[PDB]
Swiss-Prot record:
Name of the protein described by the UniProt record: GTPase KRas
GO molecular function, a single term: GTP binding
Originating species: Homo sapiens
Keyword Cytoplasm: yes
Gene of this entry: KRAS
N-acetylmethionine: residues carrying this PTM: 2
Result of changing residue 23 to E: In CFC2; exhibits an increase in intrinsic and guanine nucleotide exchange factor catalyzed nucleotide exchange in combination with an impaired GTPase-activating protein-stimulated GTP hydrolysis but functional in interaction with effectors
């Protein structure tokens, strides 16, 4: 049978939500992708021998909290919380995204992975130890990714699937 996993990618504008998603879906680094466009993608994949369908929401658009937006985000079974390792503000914004995730899921235990993207970049401002400690305090995995070199892309999404399996 084919289990679907509904995944939602969140994180500050410009951290790489779209580039990560396209790199998963299309196996290409797209260095300019409309920052406003929010879309969803299906990909049949095999994770630990399980054939599954990833249904991935690449969050975009504007910050608003209508009932329609809440209902779409609430269908998410697991969330990628993405920051950029060269952007300390995007790391600090993880608090707000985890806050919104918990709100719509009405749960203090939501499958989540903390994703530190742009690990190909030399000019890093967020230490790995700092991101590891945050993820540890939340009980979630941390993974560094580069949508540009594709390092960790599959594993960030697969790790999220394994967290969804846990709950
Ligand atoms: C190109 C870009 F600009 C760009 O890509 N976006 C910037 C604008 N978006 C958002 N921004 C901020 O807050 C930005 C800052 C941080 C502190 C407060 N705000 C001042 N918060 C949200 C959004 C999207 C909608 N939303 C959510 C609404 C309702 C329910 C949710 C449940 C779970 C998770 C979410 Cl995420 C929910 C929260 C979209 C995207 C970012 C994403 N994700
Ligand atoms: N160097 C590098 N740049 C990246 C990476 N991921 C995204 N970018 C760049 O960061 C910018 C914003 O990426 P985007 O996917 O649109 O971020 P989004 O707003 O979160 O969807 C783009 O110009 C990308 O070229 C990465 O892993 N490494
Ligand atoms: Zn985007
Ligand atoms: Zn679906
Ligand atoms: Zn908030």
């Amino acid at each position: 049978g084919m289990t679907e996993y509904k995944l939602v990618v969140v994180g500050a504008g410009g951290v790489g939500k779209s580039a990560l998603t396209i790199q998963l879906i299309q196996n290409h680094f797209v260095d300019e992708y409309d920052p406003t466009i929010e879309d969803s993608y299906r990909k049949q994949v095999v994770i630990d021998g399980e054939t599954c369908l990833l249904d991935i929401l690449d969050t975009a658009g504007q910050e608003e909290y209508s009932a329609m937006r809440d209902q779409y985000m609430r269908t998410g079974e697991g969330f990628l919380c993405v920051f950029a390792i060269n952007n300390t503000k995007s790391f600090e914004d993880i608090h707000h995204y985890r806050e919104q995730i918990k709100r719509v899921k009405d749960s203090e235990d939501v499958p989540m992975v903390l994703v530190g993207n742009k690990c190909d970049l030399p000019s890093r401002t967020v230490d790995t130890k700092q991101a590891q400690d945050l993820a540890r305090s939340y009980g979630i995995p941390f993974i560094e990714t580069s949508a540009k070199t594709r390092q960790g892309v599959d594993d960030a999404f697969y790790t999220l699937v394994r967290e969804i399996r846990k709950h």
